[PDB]
Structure 1
Amino acid sequence: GSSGSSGEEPSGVEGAAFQSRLPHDRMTSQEAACFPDIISGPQQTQKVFLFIRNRTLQLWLDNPKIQLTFEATLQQLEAPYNSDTVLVHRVHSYLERHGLINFGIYKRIKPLPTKKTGSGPSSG
């Protein structure tokens, strides 16, 4: 895959994307499907969204001990990103729903490695 030289040092907001196998400059098949208006908008709009997501992950990676509410993310966010609340609401969702955030603070519907879990299917 992508090879080269980076070194041994962390990264600001961008780093948030690194962890995720996806371009922090453009959108992916998923993001495009979830946010049609964004992908079908001006370079500006696209960036605005690509920034709201990355940022959301930052705050989450810093305080992943607690659930990241939509409000908090917005307040912390800086316009024009936060300006469009509708976006911050659609972005923060795609993440949580995709298990990209708030997945280690509350016990919500989710599978787990169990010793061959099984209630007792008869199917016969």
Structure 2
Amino acid sequence: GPGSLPHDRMTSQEAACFPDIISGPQQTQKVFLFIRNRTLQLWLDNPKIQLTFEATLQQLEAPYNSDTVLVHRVHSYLERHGLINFGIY
């Protein structure tokens, strides 16, 4: 339901892949959440073509585009778990 993937809280599936983030300072949790939310919004605005890591990074404003390792992790997590890029190859 509405609680499953809220904009303002990390989930347990995310916790398994980001234990360092969910355990850590709140402001870095907010960075994670912004990246996740924007990546999903980019995908769902155009779910008929592949959303790549590079395209995501180019569409994130500063300062979110600065931590390229974190953006890559979020994008990889979302794609590997099927939340982006289903059916578009």
Deviations 1:62-99 (A, max 9, x none): 12211111011001012322211111111011111111
- Distance in 2, matches of 1:88 and 1:50, equals 11
- Normalised by the length of structure 2, the TM-score is 0.87
Q: Of Structure 1 and Structure 2, which has the larger fraction of its residues in helix?
A: 2
**Aligned residue pairs, count:** 85
- Normalised by the length of structure 1, the TM-score is 0.64
Provide runs of 4+ in structure 1 moved above 2 Å: none
Task: State the identity %.
Answer: 100
- Distance in 2, matches of 1:58 and 1:52, equals 10
Deviations 1:19-60 (A, max 9, x none): xxx222111112112012211221110000011011001111
Deviation at 1:104, TM superposition (A): 2.6
Unaligned runs of 5+ in 2: none
Unaligned runs of 5+ in 1: 1-21, 107-124
- Distance in 1, matches of 2:64 and 2:20, equals 15
- Distance in 2, matches of 1:105 and 1:50, equals 25
